[PDB]
Amino acid sequence: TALVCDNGSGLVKAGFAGDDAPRAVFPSIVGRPRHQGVMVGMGQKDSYVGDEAQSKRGILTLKYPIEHGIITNWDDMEKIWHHTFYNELRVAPEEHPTLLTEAPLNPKANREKMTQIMFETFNVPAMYVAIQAVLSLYASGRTTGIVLDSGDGVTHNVPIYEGYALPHAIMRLDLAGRDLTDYLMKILTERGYSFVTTAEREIVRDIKEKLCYVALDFENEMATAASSSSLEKSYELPDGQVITIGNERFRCPETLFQPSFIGMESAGIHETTYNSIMKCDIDIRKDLYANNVMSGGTTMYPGIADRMQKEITALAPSTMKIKIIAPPERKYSVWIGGSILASLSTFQQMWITKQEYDEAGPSIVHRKCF
Amino acid sequence: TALVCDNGSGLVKAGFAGDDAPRAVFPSIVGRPRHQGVMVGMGQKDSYVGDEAQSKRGILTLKYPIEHGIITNWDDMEKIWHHTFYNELRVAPEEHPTLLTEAPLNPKANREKMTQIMFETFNVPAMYVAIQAVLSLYASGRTTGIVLDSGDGVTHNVPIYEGYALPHAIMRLDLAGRDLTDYLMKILTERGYSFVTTAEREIVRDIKEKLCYVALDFENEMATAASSSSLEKSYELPDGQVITIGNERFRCPETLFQPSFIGMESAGIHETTYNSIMKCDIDIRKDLYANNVMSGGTTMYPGIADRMQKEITALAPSTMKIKIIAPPERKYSVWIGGSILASLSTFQQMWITKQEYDEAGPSIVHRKCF
Amino acid sequence: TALVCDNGSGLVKAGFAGDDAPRAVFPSIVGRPRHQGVMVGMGQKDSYVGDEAQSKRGILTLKYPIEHGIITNWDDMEKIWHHTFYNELRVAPEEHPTLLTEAPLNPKANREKMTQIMFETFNVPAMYVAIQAVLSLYASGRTTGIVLDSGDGVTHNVPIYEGYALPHAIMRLDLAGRDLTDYLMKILTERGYSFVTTAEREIVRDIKEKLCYVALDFENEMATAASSSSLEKSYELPDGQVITIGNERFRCPETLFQPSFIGMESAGIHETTYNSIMKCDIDIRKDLYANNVMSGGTTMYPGIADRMQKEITALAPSTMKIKIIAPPERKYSVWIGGSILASLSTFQQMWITKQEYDEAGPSIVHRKCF
Amino acid sequence: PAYHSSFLSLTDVPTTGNIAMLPLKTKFRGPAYPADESQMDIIDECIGLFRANCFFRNFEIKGPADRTLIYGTLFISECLGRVNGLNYRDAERQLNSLALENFSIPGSGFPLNALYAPPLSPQDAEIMRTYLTQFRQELAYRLLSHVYATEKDHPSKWWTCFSKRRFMNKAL
Ligand SMILES: Nc1ncnc2c1ncn2[C@@H]1O[C@H](COP(=O)(O)OP(=O)(O)O)[C@@H](O)[C@H]1O
Ligand SMILES: Nc1ncnc2c1ncn2[C@@H]1O[C@H](COP(=O)(O)OP(=O)(O)O)[C@@H](O)[C@H]1O
Ligand SMILES: Nc1ncnc2c1ncn2[C@@H]1O[C@H](COP(=O)(O)OP(=O)(O)O)[C@@H](O)[C@H]1O
Ligand code: BEF
Ligand code: BEF
Ligand code: BEF
Ligand SMILES: [Mg+2]
Ligand SMILES: [Mg+2]
Ligand SMILES: [Mg+2]
């Protein structure tokens, strides 16, 4: 067995290769206390990690060590990996290879320090660093398609044909569920309700995860919510009081299809997918159009597969069929795909091994993992 | 063995660390004789303290040395500390490290002179000052909750969550047993009974201690007392004459809920407790409404927990559960909490020793204690 | 001619367009009596407003009808506007269009209820609701800048370039002159002075305005105040007694740079400025750092512009000038800006007219104003 | 061969579970009998051996003095795990708090529960806890005199780098 540790920017998703689904899913958060620690003894800790922080958050400054899929704070990222292996999986990491992941078009130094900490702190016996939108394509049961992965921090497209990636046609967009959370705070502020702190940012994430949905036709949905009760509904806070919301429920997800709302100049996710298909060689485009693959938690909004199929069918030539593949387990497909990969018998030849790291130094990942 | 001295506004409570209740409780009072004293030499003395002063009250001027939790006369206060050590506990203070209690939001000069007298005059080995609210959580055996403490001189709230106090959400209210005794000593004049002397203050206190109760619905108790004698009670004064009391018997404690009765603007104990919860972070409020810890001798009127639970249920959102926690030992729960704190094996490195007072003066107390 | 009326959380500031300074500058207060009122013919009235409430305060509870730039008490807010027009300005509102003000990121029910009161009750010919900061830039005689505005109830940044605002880089912080006043009421307790009534909040506000100043280097000013010296200064209360304060003079406004003094988990005004600039498009940052504009009464502490220049220079990259403009008229520069904007010969197309409100209802205010 | 305790040659020393309550030089309150102030008691041995014994990976236990030395050798690794970046004035207080916080005794959560005999009675558990708290308070205080030997505001890296090392791959 080998660990598969998809340290995403919003959730760590971890477990064992060939296991059905990730067994350690928790916030990619380190919390530190912000108040007068008056009661002596009491089992107090200098910092808290994951669900241990999320449940204590009313006294903590929660901060994610990872932003837009790039590690910003290594002293806390080691704290998350240590929590993953010793507290959440309860293994010794020196006994198991780890398949890690990262998004494409990351800094070189991210990939180096992430191999160095696995070999020099966690003492791991072998490791590998897969591209997240390649893994999501194993989890679809395919060898050609265009994975749209979108998580908490990054959205990216990787077009693949016959198992060859077309790396010139990879699109990264630094917009995903954390920007939709920050935008939901900016529009909730307009109805009556103020959310400000790093802990209140989790309450509005827990709104976004169950009140929001994607409108199939935003400009007509906007007129319908401005003229009826049916689109409005309510959520009950930790403080027992009720929050009622309406056109905020679909204006939030719409930022993915209209990044101009949060001040970005870019294509939306629909036109970013088409700009990746139209960068590919002309003979493969039909087999990409019939195999768009949704992945990552930001693709979980009710109606996003219907909307994505509508917007791509308007951009694509009407002569040919579009399919969006969106399984119900697309919430974890990058982990699911790493759990396939780390169990394929040729894969056991591809690991960076401890001995090979010791001899080659941390630059070995650049001449073995892609 | 350490001493715990809850040096309160109306009662001193004192005992050793790890005792289950105070070994001494007595009036926090010093007095001088009010008359010519012509028959000299039958054991008269220049001044009287504690139970001796209380026993001779009719021939005495009685001075409390503490006003609203601030020492207002230092000679009278060090006479009480001298009397605790050399009459009530009968121990060398220079062999017993001492734990002391204070209200939050207090003059820094009070804690300094209280420190100075302990090292300069009682020569104590080591000493500590605790904000008396958080001792009520030690006595209640809990890491979490909102204290309401009402003493003789001060009423104050402190939210604590999982061992951390919220020092911005703390608040205090200079209204408790003394001001209720002043108000009762006023309103008995509406029935034509009269009390004015520093001795008669204690007679009205001794009436307030047993006749008075908290109305669950003040307008109903007013309307019923205005139309029946069945709520009336009677009591006999030391001089031999007798009094009968009606609506005055609950209109007095109602001042805790309506401070405008004594001309104060700031709100009652229910409203200030709710505002102290609402001043906390949004997530912790669920656990604070479930842990309203009552404390201090003014929180002991019949019906006060039932009234407090009714009042806060009208303020808080009804889709959550609010409870008042009010043990039979309420009156001593500050001292009981100090006895627990002074017993903790982890606390024994927090006593401020004379061997770090010497090179720092009284000023050390603000950085070493709290 | 046009009226201009800044609905300040602490002072109403009102006048005609093209006047050089506001005609009316008075507290945003409604006062009510709290005493028996036995004196027939005392000149007493059922409620008090502005400077009549401020001068009569000894017998009153004082109610601010705005909290944090949001109207919390509409029935008393239309009493303030009625007092403003009919008593303070002595105008018929039917003869003058009104420019009103609102802070950014504000519950849009506030904006609707405000315009509804102007058209339904004051019958104002036409009106507008400017963003509170965009007026401040006009008064500076400027078109590129980052406006740091801070009043009695709200502090916010609007970065704006060539007359285009960046609405995604607008940042708001509900910390201002009242939060500093209430923190001063808290820390004045450490000397043993006490202030608790709403009338005493005004006395602490009157201390704050002339005793407090911003330390250039807070820890070094604390270490300088640790020896009694020219740091401490006297003030004389309405009671005729003197008080003295030391480092309470600069712990007072240091809360702007350290909101954790009032328990807020948010950046100070220096990092809120720098985070607003670092959210802006990379080319405009140089011109925003060169054109930072302060406004509102909380920007008037001695040394605050100097210490801001020092703090932004420590955050920003070191190659380039940083210039925080602090006008001497910045006490009123939002109203000065409104007096310019309502006077421009290009602006008369932008007023909401009574005739189009009578078609559209109050929702026209969003479609016209932002 | 790893380095065993000198005290395994000693006999008729008191015992709890099958720890040895070896003679101790200390100021802390507890049941350990006073050592000669001029002699290496088990804590000077345990600190002297720790930096060598945590590199070996095969350690036969001869008796109750080695069961005591192993608990010390494991608790040194907890202290060096704590101490990184502290001032000595903070490290004293942090490592006394570590020494005094509630811990599992052998026979209760304990890692080496296969090799240490549970307390013989409900009373034997208390004499064991009051010994092990006195032992590990003194062990923390003694260790700090070595790790902050030459400079008082930065733990010497020649001691701090064993914080990743882990006696026989066990820890508390
Ligand atoms: N049901 C849902 N509806 C909308 N957003 C969701 C849903 N479930 C998860 N998310 C969002 O997905 C993000 C986490 O997705 P994930 O794929 O695990 O991201 P990452 O890999 O970067 O950690 C968070 O922003 C979360 O709120
Ligand atoms: N059973 C009681 N019910 C109501 N008031 C009481 C009762 N017993 C004592 N008191 C009041 O308790 C107050 C003393 O409370 P305490 O906590 O000891 O105050 P302190 O600590 O500040 O001296 C006195 O004012 C006294 O009148
Ligand atoms: N000289 C000053 N120094 C510091 N603070 C001041 C000064 N003058 C006024 N203030 C404070 O600024 C606030 C009023 O500012 P203002 O711009 O009028 O706010 P608002 O527009 O929101 O009503 C009050 O808290 C007031 O006490
Ligand atoms: F880091 Be997640 F994939 F956005
Ligand atoms: F001093 Be008591 F708490 F009023
Ligand atoms: F409302 Be003021 F601008 F704080
Ligand atoms: Mg991801
Ligand atoms: Mg008390
Ligand atoms: Mg203002």
From Swiss-Prot, chains A, B, C:
It holds the Pfam family Actin. The keyword Manganese does not apply. The modification Methionine (R)-sulfoxide is found at M39, M42. Residues 105-118, 353-365 are annotated as: Interaction with alpha-actinin. Coiled coil: none annotated. Polymerization of globular actin (G-actin) leads to a structural filament (F-actin) in the form of a two-stranded helix. Each actin can bind to 4 others. Interacts with alpha-actinin. Identified in a complex composed of ACTA1, COBL, GSN and TMSB4X. Interacts with TTID. Interacts (via its C-terminus) with USP25. Keywords: Acetylation, ADP-ribosylation, ATP-binding, Cytoplasm, Cytoskeleton, Hydrolase, Methylation, Muscle protein, Nucleotide-binding, Oxidation. The modification Tele-methylhistidine is found at H68. It catalyses: ATP + H2O = ADP + phosphate + H(+). GO terms for biological process: actin filament bundle assembly; actin filament polymerization; mesenchyme migration; positive regulation of gene expression; skeletal muscle fiber development; skeletal muscle thin filament assembly. Signal peptide: none annotated. PROSITE patterns: ACTINS_1, ACTINS_2, ACTINS_ACT_LIKE. Its EC number is 3.6.4.-. This is Actin, alpha skeletal muscle. It comes from the Eukaryota. One of its GO terms (cellular component) is lamellipodium. In vertebrates 3 main groups of actin isoforms, alpha, beta and gamma have been identified. The alpha actins are found in muscle tissues and are a major constituent of the contractile apparatus. The beta and gamma actins coexist in most cell types as components of the cytoskeleton and as mediators of internal cell motility. It comes from Oryctolagus cuniculus. GO terms for molecular function: actin monomer binding; ATP binding; calcium ion binding; calcium-dependent protein binding; cytoskeletal motor activator activity; hydrolase activity; identical protein binding; magnesium ion binding. The modification N6-malonyllysine is found at K56. Its main location: cytoplasm. Belongs to the actin family. InterPro entries: Actin (IPR004000), Actin/actin-like_CS (IPR020902), Actin_CS (IPR004001), ATPase_NBD (IPR043129).
Swiss-Prot record, chain D:
InterPro entries: ARPC3, ARPC3_sf. Pfam families: P21-Arc. Its main location: cytoplasm. One of its GO terms (molecular function) is actin filament binding. The keyword Cytoplasm applies. It is found in: Cytoplasm, Cytoskeleton, Actin patch. One of its GO terms (cellular component) is cell division site. GO terms for biological process: actin cortical patch assembly; actin cortical patch organization; actin filament branching; Arp2/3 complex-mediated actin nucleation; endocytosis; establishment or maintenance of cell polarity; regulation of actin filament polymerization. Keywords: Actin-binding, Cytoplasm, Cytoskeleton. The keyword Secreted does not apply. Functions as a component of the Arp2/3 complex which is involved in regulation of actin polymerization and together with an activating nucleation-promoting factor (NPF) mediates the formation of branched actin networks. Belongs to the ARPC3 family. Component of the Arp2/3 complex composed of arp2, act2, arc1/p41-ARC, arc2/p34-ARC, arc3/p21-ARC, arc4/p20-ARC and arc5/p16-ARC. This is Actin-related protein 2/3 complex subunit 3. It comes from Schizosaccharomyces pombe (strain 972 / ATCC 24843) (Fission yeast). The gene is arc3.
